Design a protein around this motif. Structure first.
Motif, PDB file in Angstrom:
ATOM      1  N   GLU A   1       0.838  -1.215   0.000  1.00 15.53           N
ATOM      2  CA  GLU A   1       0.000   0.000   0.000  1.00 15.53           C
ATOM      3  C   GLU A   1       0.871   1.264   0.000  1.00 15.53           C
ATOM      4  O   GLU A   1       0.590   2.208  -0.717  1.00 15.53           O
ATOM      5  CB  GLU A   1      -0.935   0.006   1.212  1.00 15.53           C
ATOM      6  CG  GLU A   1      -1.963  -1.179   1.274  1.00 15.53           C
ATOM      7  CD  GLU A   1      -2.951  -1.173   0.124  1.00 15.53           C
ATOM      8  OE1 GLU A   1      -3.147  -0.120  -0.484  1.00 15.53           O
ATOM      9  OE2 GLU A   1      -3.566  -2.220  -0.173  1.00 15.53           O
TER      10      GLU A   1
ATOM     11  N   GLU B   1      -3.829   5.931  -0.733  1.00 17.82           N
ATOM     12  CA  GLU B   1      -3.024   4.711  -0.515  1.00 17.82           C
ATOM     13  C   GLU B   1      -2.379   4.731   0.841  1.00 17.82           C
ATOM     14  O   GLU B   1      -2.326   3.699   1.546  1.00 17.82           O
ATOM     15  CB  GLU B   1      -1.962   4.547  -1.616  1.00 17.82           C
ATOM     16  CG  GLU B   1      -2.533   4.279  -2.999  1.00 17.82           C
ATOM     17  CD  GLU B   1      -3.383   2.997  -3.141  1.00 17.82           C
ATOM     18  OE1 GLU B   1      -3.550   2.182  -2.223  1.00 17.82           O
ATOM     19  OE2 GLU B   1      -3.888   2.800  -4.234  1.00 17.82           O
TER      20      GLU B   1
ATOM     21  N   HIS C   1      -4.877   3.754   3.344  1.00 17.75           N
ATOM     22  CA  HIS C   1      -5.038   2.283   3.268  1.00 17.75           C
ATOM     23  C   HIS C   1      -3.934   1.562   4.070  1.00 17.75           C
ATOM     24  O   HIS C   1      -4.213   0.636   4.800  1.00 17.75           O
ATOM     25  CB  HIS C   1      -4.975   1.748   1.818  1.00 17.75           C
ATOM     26  CG  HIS C   1      -6.092   2.182   0.926  1.00 17.75           C
ATOM     27  ND1 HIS C   1      -6.142   1.834  -0.415  1.00 17.75           N
ATOM     28  CD2 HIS C   1      -7.189   2.940   1.159  1.00 17.75           C
ATOM     29  CE1 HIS C   1      -7.202   2.383  -0.973  1.00 17.75           C
ATOM     30  NE2 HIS C   1      -7.870   3.040  -0.040  1.00 17.75           N
TER      31      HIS C   1
ATOM     32  N   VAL D   1      -2.211  -5.072  -6.670  1.00 13.67           N
ATOM     33  CA  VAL D   1      -2.676  -4.880  -5.267  1.00 13.67           C
ATOM     34  C   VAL D   1      -3.886  -5.767  -4.964  1.00 13.67           C
ATOM     35  O   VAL D   1      -3.950  -6.378  -3.898  1.00 13.67           O
ATOM     36  CB  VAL D   1      -3.005  -3.390  -4.911  1.00 13.67           C
ATOM     37  CG1 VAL D   1      -3.460  -3.288  -3.412  1.00 13.67           C
ATOM     38  CG2 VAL D   1      -1.780  -2.526  -5.113  1.00 13.67           C
TER      39      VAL D   1
ATOM     40  N   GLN E   1     -11.019  -1.942  -4.322  1.00 14.62           N
ATOM     41  CA  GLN E   1     -10.147  -2.390  -5.408  1.00 14.62           C
ATOM     42  C   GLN E   1     -10.942  -2.508  -6.722  1.00 14.62           C
ATOM     43  O   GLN E   1     -10.482  -2.038  -7.752  1.00 14.62           O
ATOM     44  CB  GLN E   1      -9.499  -3.760  -5.110  1.00 14.62           C
ATOM     45  CG  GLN E   1      -8.239  -3.729  -4.283  1.00 14.62           C
ATOM     46  CD  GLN E   1      -7.303  -2.579  -4.639  1.00 14.62           C
ATOM     47  OE1 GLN E   1      -7.138  -1.681  -3.841  1.00 14.62           O
ATOM     48  NE2 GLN E   1      -6.728  -2.585  -5.856  1.00 14.62           N
TER      49      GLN E   1
HETATM   50 ZN   LIG Z   1      -4.698   0.559  -1.660  1.00 12.23          ZN
END
Ligand SMILES: [Zn+2]
Ligand SMILES: [Zn+2]
Ligand SMILES: [Zn+2]
Ligand SMILES: [Zn+2]
Ligand SMILES: [Zn+2]
Ligand SMILES: [Zn+2]
Ligand SMILES: [Zn+2]
Ligand SMILES: [Zn+2]
Ligand SMILES: [Zn+2]
Ligand SMILES: [Zn+2]
Ligand SMILES: [Zn+2]
Ligand SMILES: [Zn+2]
Ligand SMILES: [Zn+2]
Ligand SMILES: [Zn+2]
Ligand SMILES: [Zn+2]
Ligand SMILES: [Zn+2]
Ligand SMILES: [Zn+2]
Ligand SMILES: [Zn+2]
Ligand SMILES: [Zn+2]
Ligand SMILES: [Zn+2]
Ligand SMILES: [Zn+2]
Ligand SMILES: [Zn+2]
Ligand SMILES: [Zn+2]
Ligand SMILES: [Zn+2]
Ligand SMILES: [Zn+2]
Ligand SMILES: [Zn+2]
Ligand SMILES: [Zn+2]
Ligand SMILES: [Zn+2]
Ligand SMILES: [Zn+2]
Ligand SMILES: [Zn+2]
Ligand SMILES: [Zn+2]
Ligand SMILES: [Zn+2]
Ligand SMILES: [Zn+2]
Ligand SMILES: [Zn+2]
Ligand SMILES: [Zn+2]
Ligand SMILES: [Zn+2]
Ligand SMILES: [Zn+2]
Ligand SMILES: [Zn+2]
Ligand SMILES: [Zn+2]
Lengths: 172, 172, 172, 172, 172, 172
Positions: free
Chosen positions: F23, F58, F61, F106, F137
């Motif tokens: 991430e 990100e 995350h 990812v 996602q």
């Molecule tokens: Zn992510």
């Protein structure tokens, strides 16, 4: 050579890229510290919040350098962001001591970047570093020194009571 | 001789000038104390704020005396403002003890000025000192005594925890 | 040596202490001028207000230097604040001329402090002086020169009418 | 010699006068460009508005230099403002290219003025140029480079569609 | 020949270009006057403000002529803007006298432009000049004459008191 | 072993640490892309803004995974954040294609983490990944596919007009 590039030495461009990395590294160190204080066997939420705020701020410092690089027509070259030296940061006092050390290293880097600006007769860069970085560094270092002093005077790190009360009354 | 001067003895005029100096000196002492607590190796911000507020207030006390001098047709004669006895004030408790001592000396001076007013049959001056100075002095001395007592009872100056908690819970 | 001290020369620390004294002295000069204009045989209330405002501002300039000293890990060393050269300031024009002279001396001191910063490669100090002091000095000197010029052109100091009208229309 | 003049070299005073002229010239160039885009056979209103805004801003830059000159006790000496090199500016892209060239020349002049300040040990002037001029120049040059790049990438100057769409979506 | 051009003589187009230059020149004269009154050895801030406002207004008068030129399908041809006749404007009264002279010359130019419109049977141009320029000129000339008269009657230029009071009570 | 740890396999703890790194890496890739579009020779500000927003997201995350690790009594182990594969990202379309590729990698990692949760009978972890990661996602991948398709259909990357218009009308 960028159409915008003017009075911007290759060495300055290179030094700005190293500084971008160092700001990102500082962001990472503080991120690691933040979540250390979030551990259930540490559990100092305001230490965690304080370091998370510094982590985000470091990231913004890196972004401002990337903006500067493009403004001057330099080319950003990113390097890996190294993991911090520690996984376990020991105590609130130890983390604050480590942060103080970190900030003095970042300051040393910024002072070398400023010397380079002087040496290359780049007053735009001098101003950028003076205006946006040097006093922020002095303020950060003074604040961290104050925190270290309080924590030591309160009996940290051996006194968990001390760290607990500091977390509430200073960082809260 | 001023066109406004009436019932205003030369000795009273002289004593008002000495009192102006002493209020300025008190302003200086508190200024010095304030920035002592601002040092990174002391780092008690509310002690710093508290003493800075007293420093400004002393300066206003001096200004009110200068106004009185002119009101009565006296002539202000300024003297050097002496540096305080200390550069390093040791601890919150020690600073509070020193402040208490200071305020009792200022009070003693004001009581002598009041005696002079009585002796010179100057009820305007008696009223000025009684109304604007004597109860402020008693309040200041009582407050400082309360602070000293709390700090001693909490374990200051050996307990840095004590000074830290007092800074937050009393001066905060 | 302070835990926060970095790139801060002993000569710079010493020069900051001298500058703190000089700002305090300037505060005192303006305080003295203010109450001169408050005398019943002078009685120019806006001159008095103007100089009182400058006196307070000088005191804040001194406080900002004391803050800087601690920020950098220097140690504040206070000296006596000398009484001003004059007790009687003669006329509004003369006071303004004296203020202009004062401010040019303060500026000269600040320019020497800045030279010292350059010589010691201390860009944080350069920035502090440039940002917070140099343009304030230029503005103050220009304002005082404007006041002197107006007062001279109006017929001061021989014209008490001139000083009276200036007090109302410029300082009012 | 002005009563306010201090640490202000004759060469600096002269350079400030040349810079005043150059800012006025830049104001004129942009004025000419603005009304070029206002022609019925060009008819790009947001290009016209954009350049008119820059023309006014240049004029304010000149005024700030005139203020500085008087602040420092220099004497303003005005010179003719030369007509721009072009009457017909060809295309939006060409005008933007010309503006970029202009701004880099203005920047070069400001960097020489800054070098002069350094050489004459005039930190007030250094600060004035750094604070008010150098970053504005870098921002202007970056913005103009961005505009040139977009216009080229869109197919200007041969694509009138490109210039039309840029006028609406970037300058609108 | 522009697609929009109709009933617009070449001589009219040429005269509009000369008038654009003259309005710009007037803008420059007033700019120079403004900063003269801003000098520390003159120091009449409302004279400075008054002339700065006129300078900006002249620039807008020039812009309206450039708009007219394009509206009619003429082609703007810019010439150098000459520096004003004076660097030193002597006194408020002298500056006002010079402004009065300037405005009468601008008016004379506008009256010749109007005669040209009549001679070329161009009522759109007649209306433009009558509506936007002729009464503004008469108002400006009357205002400047009033200012000259007041200043003379008050004892200017020998009375600096007079100029000072006018600056506050008329231009303030 | 943490006092809070329950039903939390060592392999899960390890996989969460790898996901934290990935991430952070994604945050870095988007940071690099953002400032690529900020270059004066690229100059697509909404592409820059779009990727900067993804970079920050990100990072959040990664932070949520660090929180989860501590919640479950795992121990965070940070690794270097690798520089992205590219310094120069070529075109808006190419960057979007690269982002799509990134997000699918990812996603693949998250699907393996989910399989691990199933295999270790950890429904709290299953829920965490399903609730906070899997649909984010899918949404990201669909959005990026839509952007790639539009850009291709508009004529990117050869059409700089296409990328310009997409930057305004989709990313603006
Ligand atoms: Zn992510
Ligand atoms: Zn930083
Ligand atoms: Zn950001
Ligand atoms: Zn490594
Ligand atoms: Zn930092
Ligand atoms: Zn520098
Ligand atoms: Zn500099
Ligand atoms: Zn600066
Ligand atoms: Zn007192
Ligand atoms: Zn006061
Ligand atoms: Zn002494
Ligand atoms: Zn007191
Ligand atoms: Zn009594
Ligand atoms: Zn009584
Ligand atoms: Zn009473
Ligand atoms: Zn000062
Ligand atoms: Zn203060
Ligand atoms: Zn003395
Ligand atoms: Zn001052
Ligand atoms: Zn400097
Ligand atoms: Zn500097
Ligand atoms: Zn400019
Ligand atoms: Zn203006
Ligand atoms: Zn020419
Ligand atoms: Zn410019
Ligand atoms: Zn410089
Ligand atoms: Zn400088
Ligand atoms: Zn006009
Ligand atoms: Zn305009
Ligand atoms: Zn000429
Ligand atoms: Zn006019
Ligand atoms: Zn007519
Ligand atoms: Zn008509
Ligand atoms: Zn009046
Ligand atoms: Zn966050
Ligand atoms: Zn690597
Ligand atoms: Zn993602
Ligand atoms: Zn599942
Ligand atoms: Zn499930």
């Amino acid at each position: 050579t960028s159409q915008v590039r003017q009075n911007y030495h290759q060495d300055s461009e290179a030094a700005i890229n190293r500084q971008i990395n160092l700001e990102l590294y500082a962001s990472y160190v503080y991120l690691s510290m933040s979540y250390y204080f979030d551990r259930d066997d540490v559990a100092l939420k305001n230490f965690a919040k304080y370091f998370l705020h510094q982590s985000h701020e470091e990231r913004e410092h890196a972004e401002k350098l990337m903006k500067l690089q493009n403004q001057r027509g330099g080319r950003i070259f990113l390097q890996d962001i190294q993991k911090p030296d520690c996984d376990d940061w020991e105590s609130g006092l130890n983390a604050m001591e480590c942060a103080l050390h970190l900030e003095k290293n970042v300051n040393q880097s910024l002072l070398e970047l400023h010397k380079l600006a002087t040496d290359k007769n780049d007053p735009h860069l001098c101003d950028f570093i003076e205006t946006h970085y040097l006093n922020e560094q002095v303020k950060a270092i003074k604040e961290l020194g104050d925190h270290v002093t309080n924590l030591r005077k309160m009996g940290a790190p051996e006194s968990g009571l001390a760290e607990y009360l500091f977390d509430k009354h200073t960082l809260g």
